Each structure stands twice: as C-alpha cells, then as structure tokens.
C-alpha cells in the first residue's frame, strides 16, 4: 500500500457515524470502511475481518499503515483497524468512525495482533 495516502484517507473519515452494512462516507461498519479506504488505491472486493486476517502477512508489530485485529463481539478476529502510529488505530467502530489506543483497557485485553496487506 501506499501507507502515507491509506493514513490520510483514514484520517480524513474520523468522525463518519456508524452504520450496519455501511459502505459509503455516509456511515461505515467494521469490514465497509476498510473495503472503501483500500478501493481508494487498490481494486479490492468486499471482505471479512476473518477474510483480511486470513488473507493478509504476519507482522511482529505494527508499523503506520498495517492493520490491527481483536476479538470483540465474539472470539477470534471480529474486528479490525488501521494503526497510525503512537499506539492508535482508526476503526469503524459501534459508534463511528474514531482513533482509539491499544493501551486502552478495553482494546488491549482483545488485541490478536498486526498483519501488512
């Protein structure tokens, strides 16, 4: 990826609500907002979070760009974010688009690791 470009485009999109199924600037859910941050440099289908932690390379840490994984809603990957440096991600979260941090005491019992697209 062009990391610098997938960071800005992330960042751009804070504050976008949450929808189910959600797939536009309108309103995203977990897998819509990283399908439409990719698709803005890259030909991607529609995925999982399952699919993407399948599909995409075993880091040993994040680097800004890299795509961080948690179990929330039920085990194993169930969501997942963009890191951007300095411990933070952006997510399509619950409750919108936001930057959150793996040192949360939420997020970080639920971290599974990073994987590079």
């Given at each position: 990826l062009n990391v610098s470009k997938l960071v800005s485009d992330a960042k751009a999109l804070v504050g976008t609500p949450y929808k189910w199924g959600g797939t536009t600037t309108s309103g995203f859910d977990c897998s819509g907002f990283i399908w439409y941050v990719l698709n803005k440099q890259t030909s991607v289908g529609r995925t999982s979070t399952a699919g993407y932690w399948s599909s995409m390379k075993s880091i040993a840490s994040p680097s800004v760009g890299d795509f961080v994984f948690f179990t929330t809603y039920?085990?194993?990957?169930s969501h997942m974010g963009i890191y951007i440096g300095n411990n933070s991600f952006i997510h399509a979260g619950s409750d919108g688009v936001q930057i959150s941090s793996l040192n949360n005491s939420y997020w970080k019992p639920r971290y599974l690791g990073a994987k590079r697209f």
């Open positions: 039920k085990s194993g990957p």
